[PDB]
Design goal:
This is part of a larger assembly, with chains A and B.
Chain A: E1 2-6, E2 12-17, H1 29-37, H2 65-69
Antiparallel strand pairs in A: 1-2
Chain B: H1 16-47
Classes of the chains: A alpha+beta, B mainly alpha.
Protein name (chain A): Fatty acid synthase subunit beta
Family (chain A): Belongs to the fungal fatty acid synthetase subunit beta family.
Subunit structure (chain A): [Alpha(6)beta(6)] hexamers of two multifunctional subunits (alpha and beta).
Chain lengths: 70, 48
């Protein structure tokens, strides 16, 4: 993968690569090292509390041919 | 009255405090770098 550096403008620009290759092994040391030393950036950010939208009722059709043929 | 100097020539080094600090910093950084690299190599070997 590409290793990038964060610029003062909060812009990530490639400055290197990760290039690990190995034969028989019990795991990936790169991911272990990154988990232990760095922090995982999660794109999804949960809210303080979930917001219910609605509880809805749907019905499965009596036959599956209409969906199968389309 | 006599002034014996048993200083071992320590007075002739310039900036002895800063020199001593740099010696300690060099030895400390070498020790920590070696320790960290050894630990990480051990962890990588164990994972592999």
């Amino acid at each position: 993968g590409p290793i990038k550096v964060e610029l003062p403008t909060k812009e990530t620009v490639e400055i290197g690569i990760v290039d690990y290759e190995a034969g028989a092994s019990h795991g990936n040391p790169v991911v272990d090292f990154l988990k232990r030393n760095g922090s995982t950036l999660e794109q999804k950010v949960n809210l303080e509390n979930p917001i219910p939208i609605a509880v809805l009722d749907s019905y499965t059709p009596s036959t599956n041919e209409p969906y199968a043929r389309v | 009255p006599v002034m014996a100097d048993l200083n071992g020539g320590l007075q002739f080094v310039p900036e002895l405090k800063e020199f001593t600090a740099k010696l300690r910093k060099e030895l400390v950084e070498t020790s920590e770098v070696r320790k960290a690299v050894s630990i990480e190599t051990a962890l990588e070997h164990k994972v592999v």
